[PDB]
Amino acid sequence: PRVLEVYRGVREVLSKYRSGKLPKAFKIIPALSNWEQILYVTEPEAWTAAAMYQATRIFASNLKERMAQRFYNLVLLPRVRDDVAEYKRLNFHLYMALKKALFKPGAWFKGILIPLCESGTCTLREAIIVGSIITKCSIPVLHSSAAMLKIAEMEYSGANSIFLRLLLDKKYALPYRVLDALVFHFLGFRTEKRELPVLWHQCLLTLVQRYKADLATDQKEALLELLRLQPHPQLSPEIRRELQSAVPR
Amino acid sequence: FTYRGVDLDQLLDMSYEQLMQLYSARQRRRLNRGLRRKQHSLLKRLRKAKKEAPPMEKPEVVKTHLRDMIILPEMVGSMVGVYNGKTFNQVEIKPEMIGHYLGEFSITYKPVKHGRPGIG
């Protein structure tokens, strides 16, 4: 009816949005019930990066974490993956969109990071960009630990070690189940005949720099065995040195 | 002073749609299309600067970037500075020049004085 043509009009507005105030019908989108229909009327695939930054701003600011999760999984993350794949870098507006999406961390981890990791096709540039984005944002310890348990339990991809390492650089107090999952993942790399890159070695090195004081002696010797079986000419002496000069408790 | 045989007083007191017969085709087309919000905001600014002036003193200068303004008879007496891309040019609004645009009163380029030619 009359609502449909107004939302076609604001669809035409959002396809060319650069700056300024948006219509007030756009800002009351989360307060409505049938949001998916009017959102598909607004055609988010044809949005401008500034318009999607404002949409992420609005949707993150208005509570209801499940709906923010659905918006991040359905609209924001495909746009990010399409922009990295074609432009080989992330836009300024979309970068601040992902930061304002990390304003809501619970919908972010379960909507942006974990679906990207379980998609399997996550490239290295996407890993670097998203890891820098989680590096900039201060993250709650519970959400970071749950995401680290998630990424530890998953099947390995080369992009996963960057996320794991940049989560270990946060230097938070770690739950001991999380460290058990990390050690079990690395000891799951014990019998792999695949050549592992320097990224995996750097993730292990980071785990030994920051959490060597909270490692049991049995898993310490297991990590020494791990270094023995899967060596590197450069990093493995340093990981061995850091494991040798560690005090527990 | 008179404009198409019409003097300034009955230019001011005349309503809007009889001015849609006394301009050129361009100005009639523009004012029939309707003026933008920025035109109307500058119009309020100019009338505010005109009302808030001493009777013997000229009004305060209103500076604007607008170059597509059509001078209506309401702005005769306004003290207006127009941007030409680099610098403001301040002008009195005279009544013999109502049928013109503001932007032609601030020229956006310099007259060319040719120097001695180089190697070519």
């Binding site: 009359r2 609502v3 107004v6 009009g9 604001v10 219509p23 007030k24 019908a25 009351i28 307060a31 409505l32 981890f109 379960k110 749950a146 995401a147 348990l149 998630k150 | 309503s15 809007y16 004012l31 029939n32 299309r33 309707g34 003026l35 933008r36 919000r37 109307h40 309401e74």
Partner: peptide, 30 residues
Amino acid sequence: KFYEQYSNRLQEVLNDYYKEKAENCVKLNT
């Protein structure tokens, strides 16, 4: 919570949008 997870105002805003779209070109007031 992570692994186990998986109108009068409307018409008033419509009227405000229509008024805002009408106020872009006023063409009437002197």
